[PDB]
Design a protein around this ligand. Sequence first.
Ligand code: MG
Ligand code: MN
Length: 272
Amino acid sequence: MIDLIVSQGRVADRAAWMIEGAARTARALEERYGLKGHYVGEPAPHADDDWSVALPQARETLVAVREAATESIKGDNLTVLVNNTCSVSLATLPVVAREHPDAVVLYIDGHGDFNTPETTDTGYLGGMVLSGACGLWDSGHGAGLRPEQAVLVGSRDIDEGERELIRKAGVRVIPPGEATAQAVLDAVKDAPVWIHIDWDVLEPGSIPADYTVPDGMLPAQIRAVFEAIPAERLIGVELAELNAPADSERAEQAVAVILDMVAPAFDAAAAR
Ligand SMILES: [Mg+2]
Ligand SMILES: [Mn+2]
């Protein structure tokens, strides 16, 4: 079975349509898999606030996500969070690392999200998620993820400052041209696996690019990753940061690509 959890509270969002993108993604999974999602949080407008202001504002939502995720993880289903922003994972990753100390986190993202309060140029909490879960700084929601068990997948063009924190911490990076399924399989070795996806990892929608080498990851590479993780090793999956207005044709087109990428994993869990 699949436990579906959906964040609808603001967690530092600087983009306008990521709460709607989460809702539309959740709806397509409910209809495809016959599920009812557990919806958490109250929507609020996006703003360019500093992390030190946005984080306390998100307290109620983050605590509620943590409690729902904890219940799901303690059980025996596949935990699926559909999150508006990666910052929701400040609450879920410490649960995962606590309940599964040996789990490898595949953090699939165009970015490193490994800034600390002292390195961030923008003050954006979403750039500080994986570093917060690894305990380079205190989010107030725990830490406990060993950086040795964190793997950035598809990150590219990382600030030399941030990239040096990543390597000193011991976080592995697998850039998009190296991010084959086998490469990712070889990275997780014998561990159980948590997959966190930020959709900015993908090559911008112009798959009329048969004669261009892509800079991001292609949908097929993400699907190939889901196909290759054995269902009995997959702890859970987070889908974050679809910026598409609800009702738009763009959202419908985006969630259809998303469903195709995640189908191998969710089909095998729904059959269990
Ligand atoms: Mg990103
Ligand atoms: Mn991210």
